[PDB]
Amino acid sequence: ARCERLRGAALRDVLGRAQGVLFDCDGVLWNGERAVPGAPELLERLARAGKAALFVSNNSRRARPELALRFARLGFGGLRAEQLFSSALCAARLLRQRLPGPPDAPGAVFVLGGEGLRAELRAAGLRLAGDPSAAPRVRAVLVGYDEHFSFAKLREACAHLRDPECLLVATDRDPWHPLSDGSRTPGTGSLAAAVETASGRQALVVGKPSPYMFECITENFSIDPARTLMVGDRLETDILFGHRCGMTTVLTLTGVSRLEEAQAYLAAGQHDLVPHYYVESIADLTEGL
Amino acid sequence: ARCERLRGAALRDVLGRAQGVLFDCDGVLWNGERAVPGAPELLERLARAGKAALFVSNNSRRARPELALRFARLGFGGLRAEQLFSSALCAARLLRQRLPGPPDAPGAVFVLGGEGLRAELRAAGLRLAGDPSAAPRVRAVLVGYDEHFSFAKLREACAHLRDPECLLVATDRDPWHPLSDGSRTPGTGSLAAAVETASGRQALVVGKPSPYMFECITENFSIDPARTLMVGDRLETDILFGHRCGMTTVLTLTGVSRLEEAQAYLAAGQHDLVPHYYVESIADLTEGL
Numbered sequence A, B: 001a002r003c004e005r006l007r008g009a010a011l012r013d014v015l016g017r018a019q020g021v022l023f024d025c026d027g028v029l030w031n032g033e034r035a036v037p038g039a040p041e042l043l044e045r046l047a048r049a050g051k052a053a054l055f056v057s058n059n060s061r062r063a064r065p066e067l068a069l070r071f072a073r074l075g076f077g078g079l080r081a082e083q084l085f086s087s088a089l090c091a092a093r094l095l096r097q098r099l100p101g102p103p104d105a106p107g108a109v110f111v112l113g114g115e116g117l118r119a120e121l122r123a124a125g126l127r128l129a130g131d132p133s134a135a136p137r138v139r140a141v142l143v144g145y146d147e148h149f150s151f152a153k154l155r156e157a158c159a160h161l162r163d164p165e166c167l168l169v170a171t172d173r174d175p176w177h178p179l180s181d182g183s184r185t186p187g188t189g190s191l192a193a194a195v196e197t198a199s200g201r202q203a204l205v206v207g208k209p210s211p212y213m214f215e216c217i218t219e220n221f222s223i224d225p226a227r228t229l230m231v232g233d234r235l236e237t238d239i240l241f242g243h244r245c246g247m248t249t250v251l252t253l254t255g256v257s258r259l260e261e262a263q264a265y266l267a268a269g270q271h272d273l274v275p276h277y278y279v280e281s282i283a284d285l286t287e288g289l
Ligand SMILES: [Mg+2]
Pocket: A024, A025, A026, A027, A028, A232, A233, A234, A255
């Protein structure tokens, strides 16, 4: 990984070789309400050229059917729900897999998060602490994007975690997210930091840069990481994810991370946070096909 | 610091030499509603023998007049309010001292914390973001023990901190606190972790183990740290504070930290988290006088 500007012959060969492309969404395909011009067209040409496209998002705020809506709304047609992987969806699968209880009863998840996250969990067959009883033992605390996080919920989370057998899981560690108006919103990472600190515990992280998301993806699809491009705007999330999975990484500059940070990490020899290539926007990739 | 059990001749000499004793409160003088038997009597004998006594607490939940009440209620008479130093009181003084604005207007503090913390801040002459206007620029965010912490307040805190000139201050970093029933409550450290993570900033910490508390104390009283005992139940807070200040440190076992953790740190050569001495309870100190 030497942070090279991807163009000309090298672009045609890298894309030529590529069997598939995994895309982050926010900062890559769009910023809020606005699609990156040329992004829908890249996805079209990818379909026409080979070449698998899958989407990997740390979003834990909406269930998959609703996250899928953003694609159509922002002018990305022809996409199937099964191409989209979110930390919400993957958290539900991890909990189902890891679940410490006796076989019935495995049992309940205390969730810090919203209705879309809850809907995903229930759909994976998971029992939630907030739900109507027929009170089950809580065997996992899940920290997701919780716009209604409170000291009270934090305190309750810690009560459950006093049981060392109770799992602590976080959907992702993203510290904050940019909004259209130039402001930020705190991210799950900030809520996970509070929970870990007060409980004295380290969370299992579901989303990027955890390799679990790639396991979650490869459950459903055969992807050869050596032949797959990982495209993202956040070095510490998307690019680190790519290196950990053995993918060729492409930083796009339409999002959170700056070229200057990528080059800084290169100089400090922190090669897992350096992309193989960068582009100003993913529209620069299309001419490679 | 070699974690020695303080008794016999050594106890008489250490206490004999000591000009003063600084005490942590919770886990030392009392646990919740219950005074440590013998604790009021040690303080009495200290008065009779020399020998200054001062109290250093990370509490940011109640203003000093109300924190003083706990002493009388738990059977500690003869104490003056001026002997008590809390992170709340010291945070107010630090803000007054550090305050980045033009001279009027220095200006407003956004507070994550309760009415007792707010009352201390106003009493130091500080203007608070929540208060009635005659909207002032926020020039500091203060994170204290906030039982009404919320995602919304976290988000607002981060908005203020987008201004790199806006200070970030935390009353303390205590991660959690034990309660009488055996449960925990999250501490300011957990709330500070959320704020730091979402804002990408490091807080200035007011309370122990920050040496600022000792500066705050020495403003008012001449203490020679080389002749002062620091007595506490929490290694990472009280004992580390003591070493940083050049005091002789005494771990009491009636609180949070265990002898086993002290001895573990000794073996790992982490000498700043090892007390000079320990006692089962501070009642074991009285026979030294
Ligand atoms: Mg992104």
